């Protein structure tokens, strides 16, 4: 029998489903969450073999393990220890599609382990053991004899090793199979890999057991009195004698508790359960849970005797909050929720989809830091410890079925075939079995990019039966079906509609208001941030603010899933798909994180952080409107530190104390402001500041900024009469102005600037000249490769015009000198195949004081594509250590992603300018920026900037950021204008209209001098 | 492996259900449903070995059949050939609850097959094998090699042998178990049997096939234009060549037709099935379908090529009908349904569970001639047969899936286990992927008796979800759950409420006004007849017709379940629950049937054929209202046959053709009746009649029938005075009194009428005494026995009181002569340890004429329980051929049960007397009887009578008819009062306060003479 190849078989002789088990023998024990000595970790050294199908594996391996095999630490991943490659693959499925049926190469490893079990395990009591994840089947033998089979990989398999043990030396061997036919419900966007990745652990229970717990809390209108109902179910002989206490604790302190005898209320004309009981605990004014505030209180069930004699103990954390949804708006304890989710993966950085309690508990600093308050287990459910750890910090948690057959065509082959309703319902019944205990958990999720079937409502209005205090939700088959209460498309946009055959994607606005239609829209899936990426956030939120019932939603995603490599002399270095052999891949589209795989934070996590704030600003006259988003707590933590600035100068400032009711105003009344008489802006800057420490946060944290424009000065003093004016000089081929120490040498066979000359010093290595292309975006890039090209990505209609391409033509270049300075007049046409697509013309005046303008005009078609940049390019032949500038910053922004950067004169070092993205592509951008020092030179005027150590031919020539080589010199990019990033979505043309470069006609100019 | 102890294997290597398919290799072959020699049946003679466990098979039977097994006919069950004892039992399982293990002792049916197949079935095409049902699961092996493995017993298994099957002989070999762990979703109140109950078959299908197809009815508000859309799934290869064409016909006229390629409409983001095609064929003033006229279409679809050469065919029956429900009401092509429904199991007479045509052929003659239009298929799909024989001959069906835990403690201990949701899908999916294409079929049923879980709700909606163009409904959980479009309790009254806790029956007048409620009503299961039953149906019957929302109900139920036994000298007798060796047992509960075992009707089917009648009357003045309660069809084969009758005289008839439109009204003029001046009261009776021969009715079948008094004569006139007066003379024991011929004999010591003479022939064996006591019917017993005693029931009220046990003490006994008669009067008291419950008062006048009037006047005490009987009781020492009776006939009636009788003179014989129930009680009264004429003897007045063979003591202590034995003379029970019967159910007190003798004072007068 191939159990592995059927989707009948899902388990043989495995447990049920419950929440987590410690079984204590002592209440005390379980109150404080001491670790219990009835459960034991079988994390450790195991020995490991690799076979290439599970046929090739010999019998004696049942009996001993093999000499030539090697150990490893379970839980751990074969793939990231040279047994297989891991295959990244985002829709297409890595195996044949044939269901239910596995290629005969069937990756199989054999673990094994050899422990001991103490006497008193055996005699009394039952011993079982659980396998946290297993990817994906497997096969159990206990000392040479057949346990069972699994076959789910991201939910506990547990079996019965009392009749297997044996006292002394036992050994256990499991054949993990790479493939099986629920590999078919498995395929979510990650790195397909497989082992035991999760925890193993061995648990004795006596022989009268707490087989389940339910916990379900019920208010009243006011949130003031509160009804704890805890069912308990048992398993064993039933006897009189058996009694069950729920104990309340919030700290030490006793709430409620409740002692009852087993037996239920009558249900059915046959009676009701004789193994079950219920208690209703009365609470009065409870602390309420949610992600501002989470109040946990401890619940312990202790089953024991008449006479007080403990017989077992199972503690669960409890949270008294009520999630529900009312007139088409998604209550969180009375309040409409704004989401401000994020999608996750358990990527660790070193051992691949292996998570520990440090990595989960910087993700959620991380999160909480950055002003997200939810979290979406995508696509699978998640390690027992991540929903504990939200408990306690506070995160909203969507727990996802492990449910994917993006890869089926038509995507709903299996979802609507009834043969794989049962293994489905496997994957979803047995997950709310495990976590519904737990009030971080506030959405189920049916799973993701299944279309619509009969078996997703079935199991959709299933979760609605058992488990009515959370709303469930589902995205297939448009996000319009009968088997979703929340509407959770995926990359729906804002204003624009997409209209796909029988799947259209209407935008968010539009899609509240279709006739018959009342359910919340919380986006699963939005603002793309694949690379350089996530422009439009603003645009999103301020939806979300402005609409009732536009909830927020969930970013992709949170984390880069790129894996470790290392290259001839043993430096470690990210990759992605196609790195390790499999083929076919898709190539970069792993990584899609706000965060890098060792959770440095990419530049869009500073405007998540600010589109996100909990606190929005309004500056009327002198005063602020401040004006909180909390809907449960009180501005108790919160100072508002303002500060005003001349042009990066600072001239007043202050410090206010918060005191803002939950969604409510509050007026602050700023003192007399600086009334400089001195050119240049007035920036009012206002942060909000954290002192105290929370469990989360540091002291001083910064949690929302905002800045405004006040008053402006305008420059209207005139220059001095340079006493010396420049020598011009013309030759039969350059232009030479001399200032005394400063040298200018034109071209004019090029028609640019060639040379510019301090003392004996050369400045340039590359002529100034024009630029309007850009290091291809992976927003620009799309789903377009070699092989297969769309039309529809920028840089394909670029590459097709000849932007990368077109020459320079030398129209006019002349020179004359003026009363008190040096016109130099140039004008140029870039040309592809006989077709003009833009025309520049610069004037470069060169006055006796030192400074060099350069005013540029440049022509764009309108048939050609709209060009990523209009500027200037060049390559300074000197690396200085500091950038300085005073622009907008002090993190990369562009021109529809730079809400969050503030304007200030910001001075960073160099490698700082550049962002080390793993695909390279154009980074570093500031925008807004009014001055520019390098070096000796200083850049004057307004541009959007970028300087780096590698040129954008070679960020487009290389692949991955290890293969760049810093050049020499400093590649330098002033642009008059630049195009937005996009970020909507990562395969189609994201870049709206108003950030597009479709004027035909821009101007610029600027101010080269040495400062 | 035990896989029949393990819920999560419900099938191996099975293939996926689908509706039937015959192969046809010609579409002309198809339209005419002629048979297909694609498709072999296996049924006829195979070897067969019984064992009392699974592990004691040898292995050597998987080679070659063992020479002491026996042969054999498949299909069959092995417990009605001595190799084990059938069990009955109602609610507690037949096997230690103990799930999913089943006892050690399975006992276990090895079948083996030798056949042949030709050379042509293996060289092409896919052959496989359909068991249409195993009782109840079973392994499969083929040439000794192991095939797969089935758990349900009343859908199809079928599996592929074309890799199994080889030339020349092969041989195949079941193994049957009797207890699985299916069974406890098998919990039917039937006798549990075991064995191949259904057909065998081979099928032979092309490389590509014609894997399912799913045939819907779209329709318009008027029903004039009808979309048929055909939606077809191929199995194989997918080539362009590939055309499918769905052909529509009317006997030999073709209707509409469609042909287009293989490839669907666009449903995913990934596109559409490849494998599918649907096709929409536009229909013009279709035929509808319906219980009255069922109008049926032949749908063809052909797999072919584009050249027209055809691959394969498959045909089936298309009927253009519309269920749904709105407002409140179940509508059928939008006229509201009244459902004349019945519960049918499968039990043949004289195979068991095996069903042929015939017995189905015959089954629905008397549903249809008995004016039932719906079936239930209850508790279990039946065999695929049925369904079609219903869409041919017109019934309803409601089609219900195999799952019941009636036995399990509560009753929704598996159906709320998500463990056991898989299985129940497979009990339940399949079914709706055999049974969607039968316009007979109108609503599904998830099953019966199991409580409410959520796996309910979720088959429930996953059915809503495929198949909306049914209803379907659910009893369990108080048949209020979410489960359920259709309310359908079970044995709920029409006025009185039975509050349950948690699963409360109120009556069906008050459940309709509950708040908040707005579904229909239509009883599953109502009006329990068994035995002497169904009292309290006109009362059912006037609540439907006068609620619009109460749309009728099924009668529980069709047909006994009993099983033909034989004596030491062969005659076969019926036998119930205990007669078998099965213990525990439900001993007589299986006999709850209209009709008996050999289809012989019940007198209870003459009440059910009269209060479902589709013709309402309403006499006003002398014209008569005729009111139609058909739907669709007008009155075209009916007539009305009216006539008048004085005191059984008739004086005047006439023939009358109705012509009355669907739910319409006709009035109908009699001419002038006659006036007689002779005394006596006139009936006017009304028949229809259909003269034409139907397809299920014969020329000349009354379908509707009614009575009225018309003017009454009252009698005035003196008898006139006899010559003769009676000699009385007085004894120390004995009164007697002579008129010539005639000599009555009065007993002093006890009071009664001690003999009667006539010549010298003696007339009594026993003296005429009171009785107040009946044999206890079914509804009197309940579920009471000797061990456990039920207090509610009837007959234990009564044996309490000492009813069947209370003395007769003579108080006076008086004799007096008259001046033209003489006067004896009597006067006694019942009591019972001291307590007086009944006093008897009697006066005999014995004229000169001849007559003897008797007068009794009853007083019944208020505290005892209410007598079930009134009246006289003696043994007349005469056995007549021929009993005659003015009066209500000619069938068994009594007070709660008699609205189908008709007031006449019946002449019957004496056998025809005794209703002869396979469970002795009370039977053969019949009420309204003004004369009665038996022998010489001569009785007048108003009474109830019942004349047999068989005491009424004999009744009560015999529990099988066929112990009855006929005793000498005749006994005679002549009653002034009877009390009603019940029936509304049969474990608790059914008999409605207005059919109870609870007056407390009675009187009632006989007139005794020789004719």
């Not at 691949?352 to 508990?361: A, H, K, N, R, S």
């Not at 979290?375 to 390690?383: D, G, T």
């Not at 935008?507 to 006739?515: A, E, F, G, N, Y």
Request: aromatic fraction near 10%; proline fraction near 6%; glycine fraction near 8%.
């Amino acid at each position: 029998r191939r159990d592995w190849e059927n989707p009948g078989v899902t388990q043989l002789n495995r447990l049920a489903a419950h929440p987590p088990f410690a079984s204590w023998r002592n209440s005390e024990e379980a109150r404080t969450d001491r670790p219990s000595q009835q459960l034991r970790s079988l994390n450790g050294e195991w020995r490991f073999a690799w076979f290439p199908a599970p046929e090739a594996v010999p019998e004696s391996w049942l009996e001993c393990d093999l000499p030539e095999a090697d150990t490893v630490v379970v839980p751990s991943n074969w793939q990231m220890h040279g047994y297989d490659a891991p295959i990244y693959t985002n829709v297409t499925y890595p195996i044949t599609v044939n269901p239910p049926f596995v290629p005969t190469e069937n990756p199989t490893g054999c673990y094994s382990l050899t422990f001991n079990v103490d006497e008193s395990w055996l005699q009394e009591g039952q011993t079982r053991i659980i396998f946290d994840g297993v990817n994906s089947a497997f096969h159990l033998w206990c000392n040479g004899r057949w346990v069972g089979y699994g076959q789910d990989s991201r939910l506990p398999s547990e079996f019965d090793l009392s009749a297997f043990l044996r006292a002394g030396e036992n050994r256990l061997a499991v054949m993990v199979l790479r493939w099986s036919d629920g590999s078919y419900l498995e395929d979510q966007d990650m790195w397909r890999m497989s082992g035991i990745f999760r925890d193993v652990s061995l648990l004795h229970k006596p022989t009268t057991q707490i087989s389940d717990f339910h916990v379900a809390t019920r208010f009243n209108d006011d949130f003031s009195r509160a009804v704890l109902e805890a069912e308990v179910q048992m398993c064993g002989e039933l006897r009189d004698y058996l009694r069950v206490t729920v104990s309340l604790w919030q700290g030490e302190t006793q709430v409620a508790s409740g002692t009852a005898p087993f037996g239920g209320e009558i249900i059915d004309e046959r009676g009701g359960y004789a193994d079950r009981v219920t208690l209703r605990l009365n609470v009065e004014n409870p602390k309420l849970w949610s992600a501002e505030i989470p109040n946990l209180y401890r619940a312990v069930v202790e089953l024991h005797t008449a006479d007080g004699t403990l017989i077992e103990a199972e503690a669960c954390d409890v949270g008294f909050r009520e999630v529900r949804i009312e007139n088409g708006l998604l209550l969180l304890n009375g309040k409409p929720l704004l989401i401000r989710g994020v999608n996750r993966h358990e990527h660790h950085p070193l051992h691949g989809q292996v998570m520990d309690e440090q990595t989960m508990v910087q993700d959620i600093l991380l999160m909480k830091q950055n002003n997200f308050n939810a979290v979406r287990c995508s696509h699978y459910p998640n390690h027992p410890l991540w929903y504990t750890l939200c408990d306690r910090y506070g995160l909203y948690v969507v727990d996802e079925a492990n449910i994917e057959t993006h890869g089926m065509v038509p995507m709903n082959r299996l979802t609507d075939d009834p043969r794989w309703l049962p293994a489905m319902s496997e994957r979803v019944t047995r997950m709310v079995q495990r976590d519904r205990n737990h009030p971080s958990v506030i959405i189920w999720s049916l799973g993701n990019e299944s279309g619509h079937g009969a078996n997703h409502d079935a199991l959709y209005r299933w979760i609605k039966s058992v488990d009515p205090s959370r709303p469930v939700q589902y995205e297939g088959g448009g996000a319009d079906t009968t088997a979703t209460d929340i509407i959770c498309p995926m990359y729906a946009r804002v204003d624009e509609d997409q209209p796909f055959p029988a799947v259209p994607k209407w935008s968010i606005k539009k899609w509240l208001s279709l006739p018959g239609e009342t359910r919340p829209l919380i986006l699963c899936e939005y603002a793309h941030a694949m690379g350089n990426s996530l422009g439009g956030f603003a645009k999103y939120w301020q939806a979300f603010r402005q609409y009732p019932r536009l909830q927020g939603g969930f970013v992709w995603d949170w984390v880069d899933q790129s894996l470790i490599k290392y290259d001839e002399n043993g430096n470690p270095w990210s990759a992605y798909g196609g790195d390790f052999g499999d083929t076919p891949n898709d190539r970069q589209f792993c990584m899609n994180g706000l965060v890098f795989a060792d959770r440095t934070p990419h530049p869009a996590l500073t405007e998540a952080k600010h589109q996100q704030q909990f606190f929005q600003f309004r500056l009327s006259g002198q005063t602020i409107e401040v004006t909180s988003e909390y809907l449960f707590r009180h501005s108790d933590n919160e100072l508002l530190h303002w500060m005003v600035a001349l042009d990066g100068k600072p001239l007043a400032s202050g410090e206010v104390p918060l005191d803002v009711a939950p969604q409510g105003k509050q007026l602050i009344e700023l003192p007399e402001l600086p009334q400089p008489e001195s050119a240049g802006q007035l920036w009012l800057t206002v942060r909000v500041v954290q002192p105290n420490a929370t469990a989360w946060s540091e002291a001083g944290h910064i949690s929302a900024w905002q800045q405004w424009r006040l008053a402006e000065n305008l420059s209207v003093t005139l220059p001095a009469a340079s006493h010396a004016i420049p020598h011009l000089t013309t030759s039969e081929m350059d232009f030479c102005i001399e200032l005394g120490n400063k040298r200018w040498q034109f071209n004019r066979q090029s028609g640019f600037l060639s040379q510019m000359w301090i003392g004996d010093k050369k400045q340039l290595l590359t002529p100034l000249r024009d630029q309007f292309t850009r290091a291809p975006l992976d927003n620009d890039i799309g789903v377009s490769e070699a092989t297969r090209i769309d039309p529809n990505a920028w840089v394909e209609r670029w590459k097709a015009a000849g932007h990368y391409q077109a020459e320079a033509a030398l129209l006019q270049c002349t020179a004359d000198t003026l009363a008190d300075a040096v016109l130099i007049t140039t004008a140029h046409a870039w040309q592809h195949q006989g077709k003009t697509l833009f025309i520049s013309r610069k004037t470069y005046r060169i006055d006796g004081s030192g400074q060099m303008a350069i005013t540029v005009d440049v022509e764009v078609a309108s048939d050609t594509p709209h060009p990523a940049r209009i500027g200037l390019n060049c390559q300074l032949a000197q690396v200085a250590e500091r950038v300085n500038w005073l622009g907008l910053g002090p993190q990369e922004n562009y021109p529809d992603r730079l809400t969050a950067a503030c304007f200030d004169r910001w001075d960073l070092p160099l490698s700082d300018m550049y962002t080390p993205y793993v695909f390279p592509s154009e980074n570093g951008l500031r925008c807004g920026t009014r001055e520019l020092n390098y070096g000796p030179h200083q850049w004057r005027g307004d541009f959007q900037f970028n300087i780096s150590r590698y040129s954008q031919q070679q960020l487009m020539e290389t692949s991955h950021r290890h293969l760049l080589h810093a050049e020499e010199g400093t590649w330098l990019n002033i642009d008059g204008f630049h195009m937005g990033i996009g970020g909507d979505d990562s395969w189609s043309p994201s870049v709206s209209a108003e950030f597009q470069l479709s004027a035909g006609r821009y101007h610029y100019q600027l101010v080269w001098c040495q400062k």
